[PDB]
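Quick illustration for those who missed Monday's session on complexes.
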Amino acid sequence: HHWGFGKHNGPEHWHKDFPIAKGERQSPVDIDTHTAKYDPSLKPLSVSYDQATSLRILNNGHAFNVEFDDSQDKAVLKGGPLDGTYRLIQFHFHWGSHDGQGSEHTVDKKKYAAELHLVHWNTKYGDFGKAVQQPDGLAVLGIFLKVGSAKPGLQKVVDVLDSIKTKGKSADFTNFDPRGLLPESLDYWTYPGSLTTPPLLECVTWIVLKEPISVSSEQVSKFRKLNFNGEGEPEEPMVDNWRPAQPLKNRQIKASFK
Ligand SMILES: [Cl-]
Ligand SMILES: [Zn+2]
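Prediction with zinc ion bound:
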């Protein structure tokens, strides 16, 4: 595809192939903590990843995805703002060219070093491809990464990246437990939004955790050693694969806390 993260095909250009890029429910957004409103209707998140079955990790040319067997009916996100049950299909990250940027969501304009997205689809639509065509099709759990102590549960991910350095490379990645990527608190903000890469479909209930996970400088530096390009082609480090905050328009960000 033509789209990427370059000066001539990056986020500012996506609207030409995907006009929904200038839509009413685009993601990510800045979360203004002044105005985000606490909503007591909001239930605790239920994240059930004990039966989550990871399969493989793939460099797709703009990030790396860890893919799951989404036939596992117990590997589910539910509760919080959601009706029904959502199955984990993949996770990936967004990160920067340095520690001071990389997240897609911001909090009072603050950018984090990276952001993790755990992507789930609504079982009522049968599969992912059908779910993304519906406003309540996906639930994406977003988790900020900041630099400090190391996150032990991330280490298997960062250590495998050397073997998937270029576009198209993959590695077996079984027995990875995504519970090791979760912070202590499941306090969250939620709002209706979109995929943050093309096709940018407005099909996502976003659930963004308030508490970042801490990862070490070295862990996040390994992300930046990946390449956008395929093998044999001219080296281009995979960095700044984040879409900037988009207009909130007529949406309300709700907080599950305070
Ligand atoms: Cl490391
Ligand atoms: Zn993402």
